[PDB]
Amino acid sequence: SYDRAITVFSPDGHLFQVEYAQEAVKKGSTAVGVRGRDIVVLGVEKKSVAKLQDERTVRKICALDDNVCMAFAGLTADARIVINRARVECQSHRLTVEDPVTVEYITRYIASLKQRYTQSNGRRPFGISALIVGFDFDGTPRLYQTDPSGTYHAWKANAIGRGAKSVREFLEKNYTDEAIETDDLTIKLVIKALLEVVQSGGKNIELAVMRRDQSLKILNPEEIEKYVAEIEKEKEENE
Amino acid sequence: SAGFDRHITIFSPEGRLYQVEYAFKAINQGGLTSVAVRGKDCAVIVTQKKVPDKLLDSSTVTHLFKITENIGCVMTGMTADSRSQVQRARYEAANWKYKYGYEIPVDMLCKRIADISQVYTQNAEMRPLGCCMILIGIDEEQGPQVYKCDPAGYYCGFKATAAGVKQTESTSFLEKKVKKKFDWTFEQTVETAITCLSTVLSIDFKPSEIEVGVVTVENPKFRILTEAEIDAHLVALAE
Amino acid sequence: TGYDLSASTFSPDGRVFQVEYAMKAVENSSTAIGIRCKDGVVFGVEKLVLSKLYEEGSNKRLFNVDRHVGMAVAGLLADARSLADIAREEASNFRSNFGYNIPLKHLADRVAMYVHAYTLYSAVRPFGCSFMLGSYSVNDGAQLYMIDPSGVSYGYWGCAIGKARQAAKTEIEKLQMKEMTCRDIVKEVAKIIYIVHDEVKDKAFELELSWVGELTNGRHEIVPKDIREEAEKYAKESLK
Amino acid sequence: LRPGRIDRKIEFPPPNEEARLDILKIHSRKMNLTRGINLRKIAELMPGASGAEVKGVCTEAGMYALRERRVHVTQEDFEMAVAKVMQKDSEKNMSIKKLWK
Amino acid sequence: ERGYSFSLTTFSPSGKLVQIEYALAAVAGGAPSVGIKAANGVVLATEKKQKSILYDERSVHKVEPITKHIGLVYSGMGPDYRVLVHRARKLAQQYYLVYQEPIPTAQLVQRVASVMQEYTQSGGVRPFGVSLLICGWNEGRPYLFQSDPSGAYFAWKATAMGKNYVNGKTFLEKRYNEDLELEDAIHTAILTLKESFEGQMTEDNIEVGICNEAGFRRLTPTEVKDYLAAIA
Amino acid sequence: KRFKAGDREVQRTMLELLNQLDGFQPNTQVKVIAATNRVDILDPALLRSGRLDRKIEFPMPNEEARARIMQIHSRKMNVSPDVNYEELARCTDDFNGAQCKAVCVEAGMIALRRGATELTHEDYMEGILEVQAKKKANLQYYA
Amino acid sequence: NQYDNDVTVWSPQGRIHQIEYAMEAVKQGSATVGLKSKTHAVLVALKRAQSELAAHQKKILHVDNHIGISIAGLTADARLLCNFMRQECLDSRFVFDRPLPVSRLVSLIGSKTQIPTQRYGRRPYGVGLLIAGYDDMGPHIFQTCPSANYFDCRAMSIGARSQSARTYLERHMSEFMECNLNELVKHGLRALRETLPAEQDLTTKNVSIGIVGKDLEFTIYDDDDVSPFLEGLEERPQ
Amino acid sequence: YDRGVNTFSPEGRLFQVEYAIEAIKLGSTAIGIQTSEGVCLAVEKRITSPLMEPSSIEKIVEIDAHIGCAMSGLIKDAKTLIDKARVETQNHWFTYNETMTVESVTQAVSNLALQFGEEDSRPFGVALLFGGVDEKGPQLFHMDPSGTFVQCDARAIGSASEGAQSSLQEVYHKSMTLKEAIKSSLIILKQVMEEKLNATNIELATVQPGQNFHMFTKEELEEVIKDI
Amino acid sequence: GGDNEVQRTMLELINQLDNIKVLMATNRPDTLDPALMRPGRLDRKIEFSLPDLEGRTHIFKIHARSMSVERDIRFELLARLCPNSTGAEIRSVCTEAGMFAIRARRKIATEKDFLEAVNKVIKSYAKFSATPRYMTYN
Amino acid sequence: RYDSRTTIFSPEGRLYQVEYAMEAIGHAGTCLGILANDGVLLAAERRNIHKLLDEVFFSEKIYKLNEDMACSVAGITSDANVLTNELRLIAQRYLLQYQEPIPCEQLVTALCDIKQAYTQFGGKRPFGVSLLYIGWDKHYGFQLYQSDPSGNYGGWKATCIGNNSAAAVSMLKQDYKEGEMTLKSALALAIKVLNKTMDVSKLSAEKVEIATLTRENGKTVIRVLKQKEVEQLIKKHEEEEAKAEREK
Structure with missing residues (x-):
């Protein structure tokens, strides 16, 4: 009976509502974030179009600022509202301090945006576990993952959404300095990583790559198909 | 028939606001009854003053209050709430005169008093006032007037009304009276109120057992008949 | 049950239970009495010293609302002190707003309305202290008012608040308070109080008195120590 | 409802027009139908008619005759009976009915 | 829906905001009012029957004006009517001071209804349990709108709230010809009430207002008596 | 109360007792007294005329009663002459008298484990925690 | 029963169960003995230590140069009340440029404490205070239980296992008036050493003494500072 | 009686701060030893996965140049207090141009703690060990969600506090050196630790009076451990 | 019903109870x-x-005094991994510990087995409280 | 059960109230917008069509937000007014601030945040109103947007909400036309879909409501076809229907 409020501790010091909140993130599409030497790739799976609705109004990977993109999981209604606030925060800090936002700060603000909602009753937590990736660090690539709890974490590679356990296990054993050593090699890893898509369609994988002092680049469904093909060609070494 | 009740803002399934309903049943907890009879040019209010102690300062045990130089009111119900309703009224009239340049007609003073009671029935902030008010005043262009504002905010124009434990017979007695149309002389009206209160209770009405208020068109001022006069009136009723 | 948890809920029979409970917690207080002499009002309160370690005259229940008014809280003390502070802020705002001492009746009415103001909201509970006000004025005689928790306030020639309310009027009802000057009333208020307070229960006790009238010249200050001594002696001699 | 205990879970939907017509013909086989009694038009008058209600039209169409001491049931004996058996309750309140646009 | 009946800000499992419905019960159990839009104007009627002769029938009037060209008739908790009218006259007024033209009856109901909807969005405020019939003659075409406690405003031609409303509507659809005139309309309106008012239609028992080309006006006891005498 | 079940034997026992109670009139030296801890289950017939x-x-005793009640069940023990039984009552609420004895008996025991003769006030207080099964731990956030 | 979750509900027997419970907070903390003589106000606190190698909890706080208090109850609340007094005295010193008398401070502490007992939204201050200060009307020892009631005490003993400390003081109250500085404190330490379990005896680490006198401000004697008062203390019979 | 910080149990307890206090037990062990030379400070990192950067997990954080922080419990709550800790000490310097004492800061953070139900929320689910050197000397301060702030010669927070504290009581005495305190603390942490102690599993941090710089240990944690 | 049969058996026990200890x-x-x-x-x-x-x-230690454990086991450590665990679930941790030592043919039930034991006996049925929802505690 | 407040998370992570709300759309009237080049249409159903009900607005289900934006509604009446009120005020603010029409999608996001914001702060009931948007902009031309009570929106080429949404949506798929979506084909399908989705047959003209949006000489006329043209529209579909029976 200690789960019908947000600021009521359970007998064992648990914030059960926050624990339930991370249940939404496990029910979104798999979003994997791997940070490379010069291109921090982050992908989205389970694109799952409806065959009669345009996919532009579906975008799940959004660039919070010119140097930081943000791919989320969780419930969409809250994801749009968090991104809008973060986008406004990236510009507002820029005006207050000339230097543009870094990836870690925006994550700290996003985690600061979520946390203030889980702290008090009469307000529901954002149920999104967002992967914050961006080169704006001005030299060092950096990808973070938030948590509807309010804790931001830094991973050299991640997996959020429905299948984090499967993707994450398959990602640790295949991520090495050799793998990240090449840009096209770096993207080949995520495409391989998200290749464990619920149905492994190979056609519902969307990877977006951002490069040092570059601009975001939503891979077109011709370069991805080539990369999906190329990765398939590389995987063709099994026989 | 308790209903959802426990909250004044939650309708019963039938469309009956039980909490407001219970207000009236609190009205007769005062254990007393007041009757107002409108004559040809006068209105007389008679109340029950049952002082249950030889120590009580009889001067301040009155149920009759003077809202304004031309309007007099009697409370039937909880003394504490009736006092607040009296005090709220006085401001409402004084704001009426100060705001429009003339004394507030007895018509509205029950309306504004009723309107105040009505919002306490919607916004679950104030527990409703458990007392009915009767406003008597010599109104220009409309002769003497009587009004009775209930806990739920319903006010009506009464040729004669009575609120208290014995309301059903008091009104039935009056209902028997008003119908055999007669010249309601000031003596007739004052007598009518005394008989109504007497018959229902079955009491002799010793001089001090009641507090009769009187307002007449000739002298449009609220007066409380001094104990000598009620005895004179009472003896007149006997013969 | 169900209707007895919130002060703003009316029982189907039509009453605010919360107020009733508080008025029935005042029954669990020390007896307090008030008698208005022909030119004043007298307050005599039994104070039960709950243990030998509270210094004499502590947590006193006889308060001075204003220069001329008097309070004799009977009931939960902590609630009383709160009611005292509100009264003084009501008086102080009076004298500064109308240039003269707030008449006892109006001080009781405003103080009564405040008390009734707390029996209307669920966010607050009704006051648990019912108090008697006393004052004397050459322009207004002597006035004594009992403000019970519910908000009702009408004056009493002599009243008692506490465990022994019925026992306290009965022996107060046998006095002609209309005439005797509270010079002689203090000897009577003190004599009354000792009749109440059966010794076998409640063990030890102490008695505090105060008066308002000509004798005080319009103030409420405590009866001079000398007067009390004989008064207590005078009441003590009435053991038979 | 787990296979192994209830293997097939057969659904019985309200009959269609070619099903209401068939029902109206299996329960009016013993009836003394006149000529020109279009059992299909009666069926077309009965959208979503349960299937036991269809027999109610046949018992009622026959009940409209026993009150007249006949043995033959005409078309108007039916259409006047497809309104009795296949009756409906409306919300009888515009206040509630526009709650939802 | 069994436990979700109380709170007005918690959807029932079937998507039913029950509390609004129960408020509509309070309307469906109130004084019968009838409205008919005759091609010459709008006629409204309601039964002002008191509980005893002790009442002064002329004290409280149900058929009321808002501006010179709009009036209201209610079937539900009275006192909740008054709070509605005042926010109606103020709203009708607040339109005049800003635009200087009499508020179109469509807008008034759009904002007299939007007043209702305000109280049905938070816990701690009961819904306005009084359905309203609003008559007006604006832009040369009679108008008859019904705003409900639920916040939905209709465009009724002729309806009747309150006790025995189902029967009243059936009498209409029967004796309502879209091509009447205000004179005939008043007779029909009175008759629709006559199907439920349990008693003789005394001139201090039925209160009728006519929303014609010139403006709305609560019929004086006599004229109704002229009307009631004719019908009877 | 009442209830062919197998309780038609106790029902005969009650009606028999019901029979005789009304059989003899007052004025007799056969005054009767019966004790029950649950009077909401007794027959109305059992309590009619x-x-x-x-x-x-x-009643469940009041605070002054509890201070006394805790005394009577302590006389036969060597309780220390300084034991503010009154103070004990304040800490001992919602206590049925029997539980008010449990503190006394528990008070003596608690002294035993401590190897004392006279029951100190503390021993009594520890009983007021062990009579209700509570285990007093010095929680830290008080200080 | 069901009436014992909020201070804003009156129990059938006429009690506000929440305040009764808050009252229970006082007994949780380590007992403090408070006793004033004709010439000084000395209050002794039995400090507790969380662990073997942890410093022992501070029980005697500093309210002003003429008003000091002992806390027996919640740590957070005692701090909140201590902050209020200091701010209250600081304004009192700043406004009237006079030492605010203990009676006036204690009255204000009660008024701030009584609001929580009547308006939902806060919990009763679970801090029982022995207000010790020296004003112009002689030394004083006030105590404010969480029920917002303060009694003018000759000597009082609140805190864990306190009833022993009270029983010693009531037995030796009459002699308290004509006390020298050291005799009064040696009584009080004798009071606290009554509360201690038989095994425990008053050590330099677990007893803190706060004395306020005629020409003396509130000095908080701890660790070695306690020894000068501790030294000469009589051994407990055993 | 355990559904708000506002409800008092019949025994007198706030059954919400306790559950917050229980929330620490689900944390990670952290040990604190205060030595005349300085104060040692260690914590079990408990890396969630090799991918996660060890520097993202902040279990020892620097309040300022002179007082580090050891945490255990809800990360968000501790951060909300830490940032409440970095700011005030800087403020204490700004408004007073001096270094705030450890006892002075731990007063500041706890002042935020005594507000879960003392405003006009929930007891912060973290307790903090504050290590630093001040005018009076070296000094370690520990506080819990309940708001009590107290000083410990050697304290351990988080899970296994009971075992760690008892194993600390035996091995600690007033006369340690910084070198000997660190070794005993690591032996205690390694003893009570679930994984084999090494350079990436735990992180040390020391604050000497004369060496107020280097509020961390970077790659020489290996050297300290290898000599265990 | 026959339930009162059982109840009258208790009332015959309540009377009985009130040198015999019970x-x-x-x-x-x-x-x-x-x-x-x-x-x-x-x-x-x-x-x-x-x-x-x-x-x-x-x-x-009471239930492991007969187990074939490796001399060193940090039982103190295994006590803090079984929070709020009863006196029996500690027993099944000792019984499962061996079953892990029997599944894999090791005749010495090493410490690594117990942590694997405490994961199955206590943790496996304690609560959800999982990594994704436990990266909030550090 | 965890359906007491709109801000309580179910153990599986589902905001039940939002499921209860959006599911509530089922009781509402049916609105559909078909695929169409050089246009897009909305077709609503007048659920309550009683006789005594004077028709004064003629557009009970289709609202015009901006000079080139129209949105229907399917849900609570009260909430529908407040959202349509907030929608227009949002659109006109954009015109005032940028002196440029609000480019469709930013209108939906503005409203969707308002609707979503209710699904976050407690004490406000989740807006139980989905509403189709059609319109044109200089950015992507004709567009269709499907708002949900849970705030989530989405571009669409042909969709139906409310009563029998399943039947309409599938059929709009079954004969779904891409590229070849001329307005005339859209009208025929739109009435064609309502024929079976609307239980009452014959799609009586007054019982249907079509509003079309076209880009004419850069004016963007938003049309609400009058009964006369619907009659011929219903007749146009009616004539086409008979020719299909020739198979037998």
Whole structure:
């Protein structure tokens, strides 16, 4: 009976509502974030179009600022509202301090945006576990993952959404300095990583790559198909 | 028939606001009854003053209050709430005169008093006032007037009304009276109120057992008949 | 049950239970009495010293609302002190707003309305202290008012608040308070109080008195120590 | 409802027009139908008619005759009976009915 | 829906905001009012029957004006009517001071209804349990709108709230010809009430207002008596 | 109360007792007294006119009563002459008298484990925690 | 029963169960003995230590140069009340440029404490205070239980296992008036050493003494500072 | 009686701060030893996965140049207090141009703690060990969600506090050196630790009076451990 | 019904109770008659709480005194991994520990087995409280 | 059960109230917008069509937000007014601030945040109103947007909400036309879909409501076809229907 409020501790010091909140993130599409030497790739799976609705109004990977993109999981209604606030925060800090936002700060603000909602009753937590990736660090690539709890974490590679356990296990054993050593090699890893898509369609994988002092680049469904093909060609070494 | 009740803002399934309903049943907890009879040019209010102690300062045990130089009111119900309703009224009239340049007609003073009671029935902030008010005043262009504002905010124009434990017979007695149309002389009206209160209770009405208020068109001022006069009136009723 | 948890809920029979409970917690207080002499009002309160370690005259229940008014809280003390502070802020705002001492009746009415103001909201509970006000004025005689928790306030020639309310009027009802000057009333208020307070229960006790009238010249200050001594002696001699 | 205990879970939907017509013909086989009694038009008058209600039209169409001491049931004996058996309750309140646009 | 009946800000499992419905019960159990839009104007009627002769029938009037060209008739908790009218006259007024033209009856109901909807969005405020019939003659075409406690405003031609409303509507659809005139309309309106008012239609028992080309006006006891005498 | 079940034997026992109680009139030296801890399950017949009608009400003791009650069950023990039984009552609420004895008996025991003769005030207080099964731990956030 | 979750509900027997419970907070903390003589106000606190190698909890706080208090109850609340007094005295010193008398401070502490007992939204201050200060009307020892009631005490003993400390003081109250500085404190330490379990005896680490006198401000004697008062203390019979 | 910080149990307890206090037990062990030379400070990192950067997990954080922080419990709550800790000490310097004492800061953070139900929320689910050197000397301060702030010669927070504290009581005495305190603390942490102690599993941090710089240990944690 | 048959058997036991000492065990005391729990029949009520840490390391050693464990096992460590665990679930941790040592043919039940044991006996059924929802505690 | 407040998370992570709300759309009237080049249409159903009900607005289900934006509604009446009120005020603010029409999608996001914001702060009931948007902009031309009570929106080429949404949506798929979506084909399908989705047959003209949006000489006329043209529209579909029976 200690789960019908947000600021009521359970007998064992648990914030059960926050624990339930991370249940939404496990029910979104798999979003994997791997940070490379010069291109921090982050992908989205389970694109799952409806065959009669345009996919532009579906975008799940959004660039919070010119140097930081943000791919989320969780419930969409809250994801749009968090991104809008973060986008406004990236510009507002820029005006207050000339230097543009870094990836870690925006994550700290996003985690600061979520946390203030889980702290008090009469307000529901954002149920999104967002992967914050961006080169704006001005030299060092950096990808973070938030948590509807309010804790931001830094991973050299991640997996959020429905299948984090499967993707994450398959990602640790295949991520090495050799793998990240090449840009096209770096993207080949995520495409391989998200290749464990619920149905492994190979056609519902969307990877977006951002490069040092570059601009975001939503891979077109011709370069991805080539990369999906190329990765398939590389995987063709099994026989 | 308790209903959802426990909250004044939650309708019963039938469309009956039980909490407001219970207000009236609190009205007769005062254990007393007041009757107002409108004559040809006068209105007389008679109340029950049952002082249950030889120590009580009889001067301040009155149920009759003077809202304004031309309007007099009697409370039937909880003394504490009736006092607040009296005090709220006085401001409402004084704001009426100060705001429009003339004394507030007895018509509205029950309306504004009723309107105040009505919002306490919607916004679950104030527990409703458990007392009915009767406003008597010599109104220009409309002769003497009587009004009775209930806990739920319903006010009506009464040729004669009575609120208290014995309301059903008091009104039935009056209902028997008003119908055999007669010249309601000031003596007739004052007598009518005394008989109504007497018959229902079955009491002799010793001089001090009641507090009769009187307002007449000739002298449009609220007066409380001094104990000598009620005895004179009472003896007149006997013969 | 169900209707007895919130002060703003009316029982189907039509009453605010919360107020009733508080008025029935005042029954669990020390007896307090008030008698208005022909030119004043007298307050005599039994104070039960709950243990030998509270210094004499502590947590006193006889308060001075204003220069001329008097309070004799009977009931939960902590609630009383709160009611005292509100009264003084009501008086102080009076004298500064109308240039003269707030008449006892109006001080009781405003103080009564405040008390009734707390029996209307669920966010607050009704006051648990019912108090008697006393004052004397050459322009207004002597006035004594009992403000019970519910908000009702009408004056009493002599009243008692506490465990022994019925026992306290009965022996107060046998006095002609209309005439005797509270010079002689203090000897009577003190004599009354000792009749109440059966010794076998409640063990030890102490008695505090105060008066308002000509004798005080319009103030409420405590009866001079000398007067009390004989008064207590005078009441003590009435053991038979 | 787990296979192994209830293997097939057969659904019985309200009959269609070619099903209401068939029902109206299996329960009016013993009836003394006149000529020109279009059992299909009666069926077309009965959208979503349960299937036991269809027999109610046949018992009622026959009940409209026993009150007249006949043995033959005409078309108007039916259409006047497809309104009795296949009756409906409306919300009888515009206040509630526009709650939802 | 069994436990979700109380709170007005918690959807029932079937998507039913029950509390609004129960408020509509309070309307469906109130004084019968009838409205008919005759091609010459709008006629409204309601039964002002008191509980005893002790009442002064002329004290409280149900058929009321808002501006010179709009009036209201209610079937539900009275006192909740008054709070509605005042926010109606103020709203009708607040339109005049800003635009200087009499508020179109469509807008008034759009904002007299939007007043209702305000109280049905938070816990701690009961819904306005009084359905309203609003008559007006604006832009040369009679108008008859019904705003409900639920916040939905209709465009009724002729309806009747309150006790025995189902029967009243059936009498209409029967004796309502879209091509009447205000004179005939008043007779029909009175008759629709006559199907439920349990008693003789005394001139201090039925209160009728006519929303014609010139403006709305609560019929004086006599004229109704002229009307009631004719019908009877 | 009442209830062919197998309780038609106790039902005969009650009606028999019901029978005799009304059988003999007052004025006799056969005054009867019966004790029950649950009077909401007794037959109304058992308490109507000539049966146990003047019903005696036994309350859960008040605070002063508890201070006394805790004394009577402590006389036969060597309780220390400084044991503010009154203070004990304040800490001992919602206590049925029997539980008010449990503190006394527990108080003596608690002294035993400590190897004392006279029951100190503390021993009594520890009983007021062990009579209700509570285990007093010095929680840290108080200081 | 069901009436014992909020201070804003009156129990059938006429009690506000929440305040009764808050009252229970006082007994949780380590007992403090408070006793004033004709010439000084000395209050002794039995400090507790969380662990073997942890410093022992501070029980005697500093309210002003003429008003000091002992806390027996919640740590957070005692701090909140201590902050209020200091701010209250600081304004009192700043406004009237006079030492605010203990009676006036204690009255204000009660008024701030009584609001929580009547308006939902806060919990009763679970801090029982022995207000010790020296004003112009002689030394004083006030105590404010969480029920917002303060009694003018000759000597009082609140805190864990306190009833022993009270029983010693009531037995030796009459002699308290004509006390020298050291005799009064040696009584009080004798009071606290009554509360201690038989095994425990008053050590330099677990007893803190706060004395305020005629020409003396509130000095908080701890660790070695306690020894000068501790030294000469009589051994407990055993 | 355990559904708000506002409800008092019949025994007198706030059954919400306790559950917050229980929330620490689900944390990670952290040990604190205060030595005349300085104060040692260690914590079990408990890396969630090799991918996660060890520097993202902040279990020892620097309040300022002179007082580090050891945490255990809800990360968000501790951060909300830490940032409440970095700011005030800087403020204490700004408004007073001096270094705030450890006892002075731990007063500041706890002042935020005594507000879960003392405003006009929930007891912060973290307790903090504050290590630093001040005018009076070296000094370690520990506080819990309940708001009590107290000083410990050697304290351990988080899970296994009971075992760690008892194993600390035996091995600690007033006369340690910084070198000997660190070794005993690591032996205690390694003893009570679930994984084999090494350079990436735990992180040390020391604050000497004369060496107020280097509020961390970077790659020489290996050297300290290898000599265990 | 026959239930009152059982009840009259208790009332024949309540009368009986009130050199003979009586014990009673009840994992659910709240279902016992208030009369039978009064301090006139059951004068003493011992509460068997969940062990504290210093006892769980003792409950462990009691059940492991016959196990073929490796000399070194940090039972103190295994006591803090079984928080709020009863005196029996500590036993199954010792019984499962070997079963892990029997599944894989090691005749010495090493420490690594126990942590694998405490994951299956205690943690495996304790709560959800998982990584994704446990990266909030550090 | 965890359906007491709109801000309580179910153990599986589902905001039940939002499921209860959006599911509530089922009781509402049916609105559909078909695929169409050089246009897009909305077709609503007048659920309550009683006789005594004077028709004064003629557009009970289709609202015009901006000079080139129209949105229907399917849900609570009260909430529908407040959202349509907030929608227009949002659109006109954009015109005032940028002196440029609000480019469709930013209108939906503005409203969707308002609707979503209710699904976050407690004490406000989740807006139980989905509403189709059609319109044109200089950015992507004709567009269709499907708002949900849970705030989530989405571009669409042909969709139906409310009563029998399943039947309409599938059929709009079954004969779904891409590229070849001329307005005339859209009208025929739109009435064609309502024929079976609307239980009452014959799609009586007054019982249907079509509003079309076209880009004419850069004016963007938003049309609400009058009964006369619907009659011929219903007749146009009616004539086409008979020719299909020739198979037998």
